[PDB]
Design an enzyme around this catalytic site. Structure first.
Site, PDB file in Angstrom:
ATOM      1  CG  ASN A   1      20.548  46.298  42.580  1.00 37.71           C
ATOM      2  OD1 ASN A   1      19.573  45.965  42.004  1.00 37.71           O
ATOM      3  ND2 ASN A   1      20.364  47.300  41.368  1.00 37.71           N
TER       4      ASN A   1
ATOM      5  CG  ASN B   1      23.319  47.364  38.411  1.00 40.08           C
ATOM      6  OD1 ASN B   1      23.256  47.814  38.805  1.00 40.08           O
ATOM      7  ND2 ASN B   1      22.989  45.835  39.288  1.00 40.08           N
TER       8      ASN B   1
ATOM      9  CD  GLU C   1      14.736  42.581  35.396  1.00 36.22           C
ATOM     10  OE1 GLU C   1      15.036  43.081  36.318  1.00 36.22           O
ATOM     11  OE2 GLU C   1      15.336  41.338  35.309  1.00 36.22           O
TER      12      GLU C   1
ATOM     13  CG  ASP D   1      25.349  46.567  44.277  1.00 36.91           C
ATOM     14  OD1 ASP D   1      24.434  47.429  44.233  1.00 36.91           O
ATOM     15  OD2 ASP D   1      25.672  45.987  43.280  1.00 36.91           O
TER      16      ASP D   1
ATOM     17  CG  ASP E   1      18.284  47.056  38.940  1.00 38.32           C
ATOM     18  OD1 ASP E   1      19.534  47.739  39.010  1.00 38.32           O
ATOM     19  OD2 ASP E   1      17.556  45.716  39.232  1.00 38.32           O
TER      20      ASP E   1
ATOM     21  CG  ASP F   1      29.170  41.306  29.558  1.00 37.58           C
ATOM     22  OD1 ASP F   1      30.761  42.300  28.999  1.00 37.58           O
ATOM     23  OD2 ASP F   1      29.357  41.163  31.180  1.00 37.58           O
TER      24      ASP F   1
ATOM     25  CB  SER G   1      24.508  48.773  41.975  1.00 34.02           C
ATOM     26  OG  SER G   1      23.489  47.395  41.893  1.00 34.02           O
TER      27      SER G   1
HETATM   28  O1  LIG Z   1      24.273  43.175  34.382  1.00 35.99           O
HETATM   29  C1  LIG Z   1      25.577  42.992  34.700  1.00 35.99           C
HETATM   30  C2  LIG Z   1      25.436  42.218  35.806  1.00 35.99           C
HETATM   31  O2  LIG Z   1      24.815  42.062  36.900  1.00 35.99           O
HETATM   32  C3  LIG Z   1      24.303  40.986  37.538  1.00 35.99           C
HETATM   33  C4  LIG Z   1      24.649  40.499  39.050  1.00 35.99           C
HETATM   34  O3  LIG Z   1      23.373  40.011  39.854  1.00 35.99           O
HETATM   35  O4  LIG Z   1      22.184  41.495  37.418  1.00 35.99           O
HETATM   36  C5  LIG Z   1      23.163  42.988  37.475  1.00 35.99           C
HETATM   37  O5  LIG Z   1      22.369  43.696  36.197  1.00 35.99           O
HETATM   38  C6  LIG Z   1      21.400  43.321  36.099  1.00 35.99           C
HETATM   39  C7  LIG Z   1      21.164  43.922  34.466  1.00 35.99           C
HETATM   40  O6  LIG Z   1      21.552  44.799  33.803  1.00 35.99           O
HETATM   41  C8  LIG Z   1      20.062  43.506  36.662  1.00 35.99           C
HETATM   42  O7  LIG Z   1      18.656  43.411  36.617  1.00 35.99           O
HETATM   43  C9  LIG Z   1      20.413  42.956  37.658  1.00 35.99           C
HETATM   44  O8  LIG Z   1      19.723  43.850  39.008  1.00 35.99           O
HETATM   45  C10 LIG Z   1      21.894  43.260  38.636  1.00 35.99           C
HETATM   46  O9  LIG Z   1      21.179  42.341  39.991  1.00 35.99           O
HETATM   47  C11 LIG Z   1      24.464  40.111  36.922  1.00 35.99           C
HETATM   48  O10 LIG Z   1      23.519  39.330  36.120  1.00 35.99           O
HETATM   49  C12 LIG Z   1      25.257  40.630  35.554  1.00 35.99           C
HETATM   50  O11 LIG Z   1      26.705  40.063  35.925  1.00 35.99           O
HETATM   51 NA    NA Z   2      22.653  53.842  42.992  1.00 38.99          NA
END
Ligand SMILES: OC[C@H]1O[C@@](CO)(O[C@H]2O[C@H](CO)[C@@H](O)[C@H](O)[C@H]2O)[C@@H](O)[C@@H]1O
Ligand code: NA
Ligand SMILES: [Cl-]
Ligand SMILES: [Cl-]
Ligand SMILES: [Cl-]
Ligand SMILES: [Cl-]
Ligand SMILES: [Cl-]
Ligand SMILES: [Cl-]
Ligand SMILES: [Cl-]
Ligand code: NA
Ligand code: NA
Ligand code: NA
Ligand code: NA
Ligand code: NA
Length: 129
Positions: A46, A59, A35, A48, A52, A101, A50
């Site tokens: 990301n 995220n 990571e 979208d 990381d 979760d 958002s």
């Molecule tokens: O974590 C929540 C949710 O987001 C997802 C979407 O693909 O993964 C995201 O969240 C991760 C950790 O917080 C990030 O590392 C990743 O970049 C981001 O895509 C799902 O895995 C998850 O349901």
């Molecule tokens: Na952001």
């Protein structure tokens, strides 16, 4: 802070990640490696919009507030900048909420794709834990 492999392993253990929700320490270490490369200051945008943050790339869409992610949640109730400190406390506690979760560590794309089902034990090889 760029953590040393065993140094991060030890910090993660003290904070109670070792086998948290059934995930042995090597999984957490392996995830951190892919990571952020063990770098608490790692950030990545990301598609979208958002972002990381931190050692485990948590995220802003769901877990932390960075003030620039529309219609997002802050389920860990922290500014995302807290996820970047040399003190991994905030990242661990938030990660504990994330992995609880329902999907386990699959929440971490790099874990599923790069650690899941490998010898993650090798990630804590030679460490005084
Ligand atoms: O974590 C929540 C949710 O987001 C997802 C979407 O693909 O993964 C995201 O969240 C991760 C950790 O917080 C990030 O590392 C990743 O970049 C981001 O895509 C799902 O895995 C998850 O349901
Ligand atoms: Na952001
Ligand atoms: Cl180390
Ligand atoms: Cl705990
Ligand atoms: Cl926001
Ligand atoms: Cl809440
Ligand atoms: Cl730092
Ligand atoms: Cl720490
Ligand atoms: Cl990946
Ligand atoms: Na750093
Ligand atoms: Na498990
Ligand atoms: Na938010
Ligand atoms: Na909003
Ligand atoms: Na932190």
């Amino acid at each position: 802070k760029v953590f040393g492999r065993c140094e991060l392993a030890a910090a993660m253990k003290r904070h109670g990640l070792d086998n948290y929700r059934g995930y042995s320490l090597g999984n957490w270490v392996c995830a951190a490696k892919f990571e952020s490369n063990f770098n608490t200051q790692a950030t990545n945008r990301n598609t979208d919009g958002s972002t990381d943050y931190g050692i485990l790339q948590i995220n802003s869409r769901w877990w932390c507030n960075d003030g620039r992610t529309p219609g997002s949640r802050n389920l860990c109730n922290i500014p995302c900048s807290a996820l970047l400190s040399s003190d991994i406390t905030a990242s661990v506690n938030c990660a504990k909420k994330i992995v609880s979760d329902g999907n386990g560590m699959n929440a971490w794309v790099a874990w599923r794709n790069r650690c899941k089902g490998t010898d993650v034990q090798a990630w804590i090889r030679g460490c005084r834990l």
